[PDB]
């Protein structure tokens, strides 16, 4: 009992194959009913994993059985698996995902066709779902820093499909069956616009195209006056009769395309229906994607990617305003607001496509991509990030997520873009050389909403903030004006004339938009790791020496975080440090797996690069006793305390009644949070950078 672990704990701290059986024996010993007995059996591995003992999937295959049996035990095999999960620092990064995926499908597949033999096979789903369900994982996987990220949507494949079996009775009698397309009609019909009353199909139940009298395409007709919404609810009910649930959403969608197009190509009618229709098209695209959409995405994409091209003058506006341009005019905001909505809502629909395409089977991807689709895209992205023109912070997210999602899908399904049939070094490298400009804007948390020059910071001006579609980006003070332009009686074409004076007392909304902005720089990182995996350094992409731009970013935060921030009690810190710690693996792996940098000399950055490495290694000396450690939290962590004590009050974590043993974990973790705000396993990685390679001058730093 108490002796075995007394020795085991004494054995670990005392530090080849001597424990190779011990881990196996630990796994054996773990394979009683006393909480305090088993708790240390896994904790030993974390003391045994500080070696190369990760090596493969057996440590996972040992986690395979153990957790299943115990199905306060949730996080038990999670964090200890996070030890080798975040341990990813190429090969062992990708492969270690496959053993995670095939342990789903095979656990899912035969789980469809279902005596008590399979009665447990659902419980195995109660585990693999209760593990993944981002701060306690982030191992090579489906990856993005903010929302979607696939394996979040694929859960909506399962969790619904696991509502099938449940409703399949105790002995499967009657066979109700799903509701067919009855839902898809009411959904699109009931669709709220999130922050404005009247929904859409009703707020579109009064609009009349005017200067274009006669419109027709195929069994679809709008004429003279009458609402642009009355024809719709017809076209829903018409196709509702004879249309297959899969083609329905297409031949429906293929219409709304050409409609918007005719309004799009300027006749003489102010375009108020496009802001709503585009939105309504999004609700169409995502509904139950499955294999439904095939090429319907493609023809949708080239359209929207073209439609975004008809609209320039929103995103190409000049940076500086003429002194001799005075501002005296009506100052009307409602012809801007329709300009912005169509821009934004487009750039989601782009992301809406790819995220859907990413839900389609193994080799099905190669169908879509072609020089036609990708060339068209460059003129969108290359249009978004400017550097000659005013930034716009609503597209920048969605402008990146594409550049992400493709580079996340490229690695997955093999035979890269058909061996990168259309990817041009001139094309590709251009798309990256335009991100280097991004990283260099420091987003000071309090200057967010203010006006100032660009390249200073990403400001996100108040005039355009609204939730977009996919994600709610900012507090959208005008989230409720979008219902103030529609009148609501007369059935009118032209807007109701909002005024710019009255649009938009607490700072706190400063922090949120800051934090929610900071993720974007926890994204552009995860662009890079993909980029390093794929091309194998041959092309000119890595030779551009991101270690120049990485380190120059790395060194900066290490300067500002330490000087001007720590101690001011803001929620952003914990993310900013978790940013900087991630930033090291960007270079660390770049250095280690290559070291040839394809530019010979590093003498460009050889100053800022060392002081980077230095500052981690200064932690060598390593405030050890505990009573001191709680002292600081009051000065620093107080916010992050306010939430962590807020959980166990309102929102249980499925722990926290009396997790007396794991309760000490809560005692442990808060020290790292205490630690990496002020400034480990990374330290050993740090020192490994210099010793691989003036030795006389070298001792001075060690002496320093």
């Amino acid at each position: 009992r108490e002796t075995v672990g007394e020795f085991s704990s004494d054995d670990d701290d005392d530090i080849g194959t001597r424990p190779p059986r011990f881990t196996q024996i630990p796994p054996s010993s773990a394979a009683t009913q006393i909480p305090t007995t088993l708790e240390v059996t896994t904790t030993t591995l974390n003391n045994k994993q500080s070696k190369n003992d990760n090596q493969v999937n057996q440590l996972n295959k040992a986690q395979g059985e153990a957790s299943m049996l115990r199905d306060n035990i949730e996080r038990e095999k999670e964090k200890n698996i996070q030890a080798v999960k975040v341990n990813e620092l190429v090969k062992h990064l990708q492969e270690l995902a496959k053993l995670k995926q095939e342990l789903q499908k095979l656990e899912d597949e035969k789980k469809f066709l279902q005596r008590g033999k399979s009665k447990r096979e659902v419980i195995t789903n109660v585990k693999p779902p209760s593990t993944t369900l981002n701060t306690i994982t982030p191992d090579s996987s489906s990856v993005a820093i903010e929302a979607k990220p696939q394996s979040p949507q694929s859960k909506k494949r399962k969790i619904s499909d696991n509502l099938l079996k449940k409703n399949m009775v105790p002995l499967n009698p009657n066979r109700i069956i799903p509701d067919e397309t009855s839902l898809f009609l009411e959904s699109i019909l009931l669709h709220q616009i999130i922050g404005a009353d009247l929904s859409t199909i009703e707020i579109l139940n009064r609009l009349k195209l005017d200067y274009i009298t006669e419109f027709k395409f195929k069994n679809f007709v709008i004429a003279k006056g009458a609402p642009i919404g009355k024809s719709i609810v017809s076209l829903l009910l018409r196709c509702k009769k004879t249309l297959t649930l899969d083609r329905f959403i297409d031949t429906l969608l293929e219409d709304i395309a050409v409609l918007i197009k005719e309004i799009s190509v300027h006749p003489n009618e102010s375009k108020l229906a496009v802001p709503f229709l585009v939105a309504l098209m999004y609700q169409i695209v995502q509904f139950r994607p499955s294999a439904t959409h095939n090429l319907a995405l493609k023809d949708c994409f080239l359209f929207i990617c073209d439609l975004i091209r008809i609209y320039h003058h929103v995103l190409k506006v000049p940076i500086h305003e003429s002194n001799m341009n005075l501002h005296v005019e009506p100052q009307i905001f409602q012809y801007e607001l329709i300009d912005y909505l169509i821009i934004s809502y487009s750039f989601d629909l782009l992301e809406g496509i790819l995220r859907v395409l990413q839900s389609h089977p193994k080799q099905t991807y190669m169908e879509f991509f072609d020089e036609n689709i990708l060339k068209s895209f460059e003129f969108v992205y290359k249009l978004a990030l400017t550097i000659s023109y005013k930034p716009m912070v609503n597209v920048i997210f969605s402008a990146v997520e594409v550049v992400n999602i493709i580079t996340s899908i490229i690695l997955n399904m093999d035979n890269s873009s058909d061996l990168k049939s259309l990817i041009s070094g001139s094309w590709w490298r251009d798309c990256i050389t335009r991100l280097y400009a991004l990283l260099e804007k420091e987003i000071k948390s309090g200057d967010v909403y203010n006006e100032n020059v660009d390249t200073t910071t990403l400001h996100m001006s108040k005039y355009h903030d609204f939730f977009g579609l996919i994600r709610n980006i900012g507090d959208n003070e005008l989230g409720g004006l979008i219902s103030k332009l529609i009148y609501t009686d007369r059935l009118q074409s032209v807007p109701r004339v909002i005024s710019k004076e009255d649009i938009g007392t607490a700072p706190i909304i400063g922090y949120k938009m800051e934090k929610w902005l900071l993720k974007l720089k926890d994204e552009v990182l995860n662009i890079f790791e993909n980029l390093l995996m794929i091309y194998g350094d041959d092309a000119t992409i890595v030779n551009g020496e991101m270690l120049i731009h990485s380190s120059k970013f790395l060194s900066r935060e290490q300067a500002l975080m330490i000087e001007r921030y720590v101690g001011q009690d803001s929620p952003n810190l914990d993310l900013r440090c978790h940013l900087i710690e991630h930033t090291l693996t960007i270079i660390y792996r770049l250095w280690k797996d290559h070291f040839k940098q394809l530019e010979e000399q590093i003498k460009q950055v050889e100053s800022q690069l060392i002081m980077s490495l230095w500052r981690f290694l200064v932690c060598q000396t390593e405030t050890a006793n505990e009573r001191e450690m709680r002292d600081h939290r009051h000065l620093v962590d107080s916010l992050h305390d306010l939430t962590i004590k807020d959980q166990a009050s309102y929102y249980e974590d499925a722990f926290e009644d009396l997790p007396e043993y794991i309760e000490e974990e809560l005692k442990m973790q808060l020290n790292k949070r205490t630690g990496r705000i002020m400034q480990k396993f990374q330290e050993m990685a740090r020192t490994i950078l210099e010793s691989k390679s003036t030795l006389e001058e070298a001792d001075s730093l060690y002496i320093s």
Binding site: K119, V126, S130, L133, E146, A147, I159, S160, N162, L163, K166, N167, Q192, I194, G195, K444, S445, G446, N452, T456, R471, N472, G479, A506, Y511, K512, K515, S555, R564, G567, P571, K603, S607, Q608, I610, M611, V618, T623, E628, R630, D631, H632, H634, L635, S638, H640, L642, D646, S649, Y650, Y651, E652, D657, M678, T694, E697, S700, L701, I703, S704
Partner: protein, 462 residues
């Protein structure tokens, strides 16, 4: 299949909350609205088929209550109203499938009627006349649920800083503090005391507003902006001597004493942050009794964290209007920092000078900037690296290019190099790397300055 059912709610029920945006404080919040749209259905479609009820009321009650917490009056109210419609099963015969719901049905209609309602008898919001309402009443003790309803039922009745006051239960608070803290000081507290250390300074960042209800994160103290941070302070501002209440409270208490030398291992840091906010609003007292001695003692100690924390203070002693603006009070700081040779200091010493440079301007800045590049770019290698980081990092702050940053300092330096010329041939080529221009370019741009001093003097090298 009895339990497996009831579990997949608490898989998703507690799923959608874990991806909330947090933000701590009193309001949770959610990111992707589509998420809540892929759950509220499958909670509806679950309980609606009405199967799998193993009693114990473990989950469904909390969950159907837990989601309503995210919404309440929040912008997602309607997102809750339309999808999860209870009026389906509503069924008021006075017998009301589950007895937890009635609370949330209470609140819903309770926020509906508006208009009059009635006053709170139990101290719950404003009650309504019911045919009864006593199903809500008091909660059975399930623990984590018993708090939940309490949080929901009281939401109608009407700040961070008040937490620390309530953590240990303005003229009142002062005489509350000053009388208490000294009693709180006397007998054996590192912690209970150091709690006061922070709430002191906060008051100062509040007290500066004299030149209650809603205050947190003082705008100057706690929030960044993109310029030079030390041009945001006002040089002329209340003298901390007699016009700073808190400062006084802290002075006679933590600032003299036999103990301040060796004591207060973490606590000593406490007064520092506290001391910072004080001076940031208060031009400090121009030895300055024990205060500046503390910075001495602090700066010297061999623990890393405490050192780097003291560097933050130094620039505050620099900037002042009134007494000794550009006068000696800047010079004393020079000599002290000039005094430290210690091999451990290092990183401190370099961080310091950069700060003073930022604080100064005009003619002093031009001299001081020289002194950095003078010595700190010279021989010692354990040093010269970092001096190349800072000034190249400082350039980003005030947003000039390092070459544009220099200007003047080059005509003064370059004459000396031109004096020694190629017999030296080190400091020069070490410098050109920093500016990045070609060495042939820089000289032929500056050649007017070197040649009058080149061939004539130091004729040893012609």
């Amino acid at each position: 299949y009895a339990e497996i059912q009831l579990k997949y709610i608490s898989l998703v029920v507690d799923y959608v909350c874990n991806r909330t945006i947090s933000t701590a404080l009193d309001a949770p919040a959610l990111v992707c609205c589509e998420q809540l749209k892929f759950v509220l259905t499958t909670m509806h479609h679950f309980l609606d088929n009405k199967y799998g009820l193993l009693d114990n009321d473990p989950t469904m009650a909390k969950g159907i209550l837990r989601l309503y917490s995210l919404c309440i009056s929040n912008d997602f109210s309607k997102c809750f109203v339309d999808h999860f419609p209870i009026d389906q099963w509503a069924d008021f015969s006075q017998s009301e499938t589950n007895k937890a719901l009635s609370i949330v049905y209470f609140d819903l209609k309770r926020r509906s009627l508006p208009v009059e309602a009635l006053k709170y008898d139990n101290k719950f919001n404003i009650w309504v006349y019911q045919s009864p309402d006593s199903s809500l009443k008091n909660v059975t003790s399930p623990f984590d649920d018993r708090y939940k309803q309490l949080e929901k039922l009281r939401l109608l009745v009407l700040l961070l800083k008040y937490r620390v006051n309530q953590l240990s239960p303005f003229k009142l608070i002062l005489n509350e503090a000053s009388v208490s803290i000294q009693t709180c000081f006397k007998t054996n507290n590192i912690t209970r005391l150091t709690s006061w250390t922070v709430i002191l300074g906060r008051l100062a960042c509040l007290e500066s507003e004299k030149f209650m209800d809603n205050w947190y994160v003082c705008h100057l103290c706690d929030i960044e902006k993109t310029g030079n941070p030390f041009v945001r302070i006002n040089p002329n501002r209340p003298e901390a001597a007699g016009k700073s209440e808190i400062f006084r409270i802290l002075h006679s208490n933590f600032l003299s004493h036999p103990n301040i030398d060796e004591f207060s291992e973490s606590l000593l840091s406490g007064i520092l942050f506290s001391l910072h906010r004080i001076f940031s609003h208060f031009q400090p007292p121009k030895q300055i009794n024990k205060s500046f001695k503390l910075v001495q003692k602090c700066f010297m100690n061999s623990n890393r964290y405490l050192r780097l924390l003291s560097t933050r203070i130094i620039p505050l002693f620099n900037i002042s209007d009134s007494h000794n603006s550009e006068d000696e009070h800047t010079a004393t700081l020079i000599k002290f920092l000039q005094s430290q040779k210690l091999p451990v200091v290092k990183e401190n010493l370099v961080i310091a000078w950069t700060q003073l440079t930022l604080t100064t301007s005009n003619d002093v800045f031009d001299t001081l900037l020289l002194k950095l590049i003078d010595i700190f770019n010279s021989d010692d290698y354990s040093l010269r690296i970092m001096m190349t980081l800072q000034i190249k990092n400082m350039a980003k702050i005030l947003k000039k290019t390092p070459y544009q940053l220099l200007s003047p300092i080059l005509p003064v330096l370059l004459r000396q190099l031109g004096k020694n010329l190629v017999e030296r041939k080190v400091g020069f080529q070490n410098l050109i790397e920093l500016l990045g221009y070609s060495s042939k370019t820089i000289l032929d741009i500056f050649q007017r300055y070197i040649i009058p001093y080149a061939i004539i003097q130091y004729k040893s090298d012609v």
